[PDB]
Symmetry: C4
Subunit: 497 residues, 4 copies
């Protein structure tokens, strides 16, 4: 009755009565979510939590499609509902109420990834002195066409459970707007300010330390003993001393990266199904650590097979230096494109190319009578065509010339001239598509680095720098108390006047 | 008189009289096809089949150009004519009348490929209780802005001769909209539902069985006897037993694919002129079967030349595994692009490159005096330049150094640096063009697989699943009887309200 | 006075008086060219040739900028002036008057390349019976929305000196619209009709004959005598007879192409500055003929150096078969792109690459002490890097390892990885730009082939086919005589009604 | 009070009182910069230099954002202020006042790079005889729709300290519009006129002289003595005489380029941080000179290591010939693209590729036991994969086959197939982006060449040609004196009428 009549958008029906689409589980949520501006007014004058913990604000954000009209009336109705909550209940902070997951409506908007409501809440301001405390953005002053704005940033830096910026950064990448979500003024300028302030220096110190670690590890690997099986007994030579110091430093760094990989996985707890896409760099750093530890295990197991794992660790550590080039803007896009291919284009192309290579490998191997008769050897001899180093007659031990050479021509036309250039065209398309995208994936993960660095910060460095500035605000009618950690930012728009 | 006056769009002329462009062969067809809304009303109040079997509805669809205004008034006039048929003759189902080809007007629209009238008929609904049975789309209910729609789907799943979806899928690809024709709501959701329901499992079972067949066939080919001429006498060794089992299984699969190719060609009966373009995969599977059967023939003919055909079958079977990757969405586009090149770009480029290669091959061969003097050998030595493995002096047995080396430089500049990169640029253009196209060619052939799988389904599996759901409809004035196999689908549009 | 006042666009000034921009050299030309609709009326009521032979129509076409407003009022004023010429002088055919160059105003519009006035004159029609003969386009009839139009085509097929289509086709390519100029209805359909009618068959007969000539010439070249110096004495063997027949046929074709090149150059007389751009194919065919004749000269000069020229002719003849692939639509674009590169991109890239190659060649040669010390040999060894067949240590006879290997690395980075891929990117840009352009350059030169084929046609084949159809037209008031060679074409536009 | 009230845009506040954003440091600058059209009128009726030397005009240009509305009202208010300066003070030339840097407001606009105000001042004209001298553009006459305009060009050719064109050309490339800034009519036509007039001939003479110098230097290098250590004693042979002449000419050119590099660096004094980006060609010419001088030093130091530096100079001189190809239009874009890559794409890709190459080099070297064991040798053997000349088994001296070959496959997939094609895609994107940009970077540096050539011109050639023409102008009310070096240019716009 109430549900059907309210959903009918009939004011008369609601006035007469009261006197799988998810829209909340209470009448207020239905009325608000259905664009009923006046019906909610009557229902209030004729902050509830539903069975899922979602209040009317949660039902508002849950329904928004992020489109222009959706964002328009959703923001408007959010404002009206929050005002009537203000006038009827000034002291109540309806936003503080959280669902089962524990997110506030702003945090819910960030989690789901709707930039409309997010930007509205971020830039919100209410002139009316009826509820002056209820404004997110405070305008400091204007001298000419200049405007020095302030933004509240209550839970954007460090909240009770999850801050807004944390949720944006640690999104599983299924959230659509994620990169664009950082473009909004307060978050963007806050990120750049934190980066320039102190996190830049720590990041370069980390980068230099990692370079130093990799250089000493490369030296210690290069000059490994070649006599006998390990472990090789310590010698009194200065070279021996430097070498044992290099090995112990390298394995210390290895276990360090191992523990950091574990603790990252525990903190984030990402889905194993989407482990690669969200976190590519961490997997590689962890696997480098794992190769180092496996190498140490095989080393003290009295096996010569330790150099196999150690060499993989050495190569992968150098090829993991790109992670630091995401600290810059110019190089970070470049590395992001390598991540995108190795995740998307290169696995595709490898499965297809392996179908082709294996088909023609088995074909030529069965054709050859019989030394290139090991299916491995023929696979290599057919792979050497892709690198432009193969030859049309690697063998002469076939009964049939026409069949063999036809097989090789068909393979070369299929892979060297056709598949490989399909990959060239596809990576051209990828660069064309993501020339704009990578510019903000870079920012997104630059934000992840900032959050990781500040999280791994002790009391002294964290107390020495907190975001924004603690500034008093408009006193509330309940107790004349409103002081917040508000950030400050400038702006000059001529049309503002 | 009637024809000329009616075509003049003069209501007065028709009222006075009655009282190579194909527009139907009766006055009603001319009046309807010429946008004469009122003239047809008088002609009715002042369902015929013409000499070609085309009724007024057939003349309507035949005339539509599928453009915005054409579709607009064609759909409108179709509605008006069908309503007047309803009021004057409620019991008559004018659409059931078919032309000589046997297609209904909806089937005719699908065959010709006009998405305008097709989408109109697919989404048609008539509120008026004057003829309530005459609505294609039935709205189940609406709780809020939710709308649970139902679509009739009379002949879209299994009709008397040809269903709508069958005609869309088995189109010769000359029909323009074919891919877009599957995007329309009922067909699209019906396809995805059928795929997810049961056809997905059968397709993966088929894919795994094909992989198993190819692996056992690869093993049986690899370990073929190398002693003497065939047939090789059975041995009591376990290896001999496994090998004979592998050979008999491989040839059984070969004859299976042979028969399936034949029966496909009989069912579809495609034009030999356009055999490749419409059906690329079937040709390859059939030719693999043909190579296997030729190999068996040469095997029991006591010839050593069986391995030639068997090896071609083995290679082509592996390279035909891409057909299954059209079952996925990510990989199917990739395989479709290979089909597109081998049909369009690669034949072009091969004819041109063969002109160039043969010209410079004959040039260098006539220049050489004389061992590279076989026109085959020089062709290979000039082909090795394309793969980046050739050399500017493969021979020294020429009287003229300048002429020979000039020929080679001109060839390399013409083919390696210029033609081959024209192919690179062309495939870049192809990917740029069809990045959107392949996304729906994939769907189109995914639909072909679904239809093929359901067609090759016995009574039990077909009766266990029929599309849509049998639900009663608005009773007709003739006998109060309207029950259809109507599909159900949800939708949420805010502007609908 | 008259000039300044008329150019002032003051009707009062002209009425009072009469009672380096090229705008014609008479008052009427100034008034018409300056948008003075009424002033010309008074000047006529208050067909001259100027010192350059340009009438008012010539001054009209000379001034048009081909833009939307320019074409609009130019076409309008052309119509008004031509009508007033009609009423004041019905018998006069003002268009027949020609300038010094001999072009009529329509021919002048075609020569200068303004598609606006050209399309207007091509599609012109005048309903008014005041001058019914003065309409270019005659509407045959309309049955429904069908319209069977007729176009006059007086001088479009075969005029006194230069036909319209001839001027469009033989344009020096500086004319901007040239390709688009053939898209206009009468010319386009006339071209396609002539092609399908008889010229298609002659073109394929020519193509097959050329293939036959090249095959017999390839055979005669391949089996040349290798003993002694020429001329080689005739032998009674059947092989000798076939070989002398092949040689005489080949040289006959060579002299044939030589004479055709000469007569083409005399007929067209193109500028030597722009000889390549306008006529690429003719230069190559002529040079093949020239190589054959030089080979015959050296052959009968008792020199073994005839095979050098003959081999160049043999290679270039095969590589000239692309000219026939411009007869098709699919392959013609492909060949046109090769023409475009060899004219534009490849000369650019060769000059730059030769600067680089010569710089590093001389560098490495001076570095080497000393066998790779011939500047030719080092140039080849550095060219072999581009084809992916070079090696970083081709020699060891250098005093300095670091300098030599640095030179080679710098060269490889500069040419193999950077210049060569600049060429790849540039040809990608070229294909991207001209994917649409080539589609109509093909048509343009397909038109050139049609004109060449019909020009080289005797009385019988020309009288057996003349374009259009001789049909009587609206009788003129002067003598009631108007019969023209009018072409016929259909059209169906719904908005026409 | 005055500042705040004026910035409030309240005319009443200013009338009542009077009776880090940079907007000038005086009330007039604030009123003008804030769009207060009327307030400045009162302030004048109720040419100051501020502490930074910026007058109201400087404050106007400093504030413009170059956007459509910004340029609109900035140009309008500039006109109004300059007129009121005219009426109140006709004799005063407010523009002549300069800031501390010495730039006039036009020069300031050019320096900052705002094309709006620049184009306005360049094309300015004032019809009103109230101040007729105050018009930049003078219209010579109009015969029909023709208009022969004149532009003043006071300080555009040769001013007191810095001309307008000089500032545009010598911009540090941080100025955004720089290329577009030369497109404006007077500057563009003035550049092309100067180029065609005399600078073209001098540039070709310089190009031919440089080619001659490089050829004689190449010859003198090629035939260097190979016996003993330098200096090689003079011989009486004619070859010895030509060789000493070649060496002395080559070193004379070397010192010439050295001095020109020094004097360029002194005149321009560009920032060492952005030395490459603004001036790529000069660095290369200077470094060629430096290599030649180092070679002479090592030559007279009795060392055989002179050929190392001389060979680098020889190679780099040839590869520096591209600088002259920026004199043409077709080739200049081509060379500019090489500059852009070697500055932007190639350093990026080299740092990443060096990370990868070094990682896998150290990996394979530590894996190898041990001749390819020098880390240099393995780096070369892994670089040879990029050029398509490497091989998967260059060595067999490894204990582990799987690990080694896995390392090589991973490297080849990472660099040859993935990184190198990321570079191909990136350079494709670069060409796509700058196909339009390079067309005007070419013009920009062609302007730099013109300015350099005229600057290095004596009294005779400079007095023989000065830009524009000295023509009298509208006499000023102060002393009836206005004569300027005004340039002349034609134009034909139909809409002008
Ligand atoms: C089987 O269906 C498909 C297959 C493919 C890829 N496979 C091919 O293109 C086969 C080409 C022929 C290669 C045979 C070589 C022999 C002579 C050694 C793409 C799309 C499909 O639908
Ligand atoms: C000189 O002005 C220009 C030159 C170029 C091309 N030249 C280069 O890029 C030189 C690169 C350095 C190559 C030197 C190799 C030595 C070490 C053997 C383009 C644009 C210009 O304006």
């Amino acid at each position: 009755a109430l549900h059907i009549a309210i959903e009918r958008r009939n004011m008369t029906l609601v006035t007469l009565l009261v006197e799988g689409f998810y829209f909340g589980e209470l009448p207020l949520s239905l009325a608000a979510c259905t664009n009923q501006l006046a019906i909610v007014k009557f229902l209030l004058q004729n902050s509830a939590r539903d069975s899922v913990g979602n209040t009317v604000l949660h039902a508002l954000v849950e329904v928004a499609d992020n489109t222009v009209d959706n964002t328009k009336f959703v923001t408007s109705m959010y404002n009206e509902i929050l005002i009537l909550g203000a006038k009827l209940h000034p002291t109540l902070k309806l936003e503080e109420i959280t669902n089962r997951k524990g997110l506030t409506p702003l945090a819910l908007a960030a989690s789901s990834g709707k930039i409309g409501v997010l930007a509205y809440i971020l830039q919100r301001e209410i002139h009316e002195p009826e509820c002056r405390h209820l404004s997110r953005k405070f305008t400091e002053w204007a001298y000419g066409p200049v405007h020095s704005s302030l933004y509240d940033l209550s839970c954007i830096d460090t909240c009770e459970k999850n801050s807004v910026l944390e949720v944006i950064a640690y999104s599983s990448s299924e959230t659509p707007n994620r990169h664009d979500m950082l473009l909004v003024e307060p978050l963007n300028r806050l990120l750049q300010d934190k980066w320039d302030r102190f996190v830049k220096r720590i990041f370069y110190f980390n980068f230099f330390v990692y370079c130093l670690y990799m250089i000493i590890f490369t030296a210690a690997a290069y000059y490994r003993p070649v006599e006998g099986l390990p472990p090789y007994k310590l010698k009194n030579t200065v070279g021996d001393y430097f070498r044992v110091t290099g090995e112990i430093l390298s394995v210390s760094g290895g276990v360090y990266f191992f523990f950091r990989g574990i603790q990252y996985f525990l903190q984030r707890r990402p889905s194993l199904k989407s482990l690669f896409v969200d976190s590519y760099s961490e997997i590689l750093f962890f696997v480098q650590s794992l190769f180092m530890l496996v190498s140490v295990v095989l080393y003290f197991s009295q096996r010569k097979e330790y150099v196999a794992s150690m060499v993989f660790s050495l190569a992968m550590g150098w090829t993991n230096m790109l992670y630091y080039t995401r600290g810059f803007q110019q190089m970070g896009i470049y590395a992001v494109m390598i991540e995108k291919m190795i995740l998307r284009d290169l696995c595709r192309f490898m499965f297809v190319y392996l179908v082709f290579l294996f088909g023609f490998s088995t074909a030529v191997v069965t054709l050859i009578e019989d030394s290139y008769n090991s299916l491995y050897s023929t696979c290599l001899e057919l792979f050497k065509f892709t690198i432009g180093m193969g030859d049309l007659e690697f063998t002469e031990n076939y009964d049939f010339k026409a069949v063999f050479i036809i097989l090789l021509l068909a393979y070369v036309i299929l892979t060297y001239i056709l598949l490989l250039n399909m990959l060239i065209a596809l990576m051209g398309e990828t660069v064309n598509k993501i020339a704009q995208e990578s510019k903000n994936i870079w920012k997104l993960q630059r934000a992840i680095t900032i959050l990781d660095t500040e999280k791994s910060f002790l009391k002294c460095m964290r107390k020495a720098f907190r975001s924004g500035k603690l500034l008093q605000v408009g006193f509330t009618p309940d107790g004349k108390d409103d002081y917040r950690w508000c950030f400050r930012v400038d702006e000059v728009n001529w049309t503002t006047w």
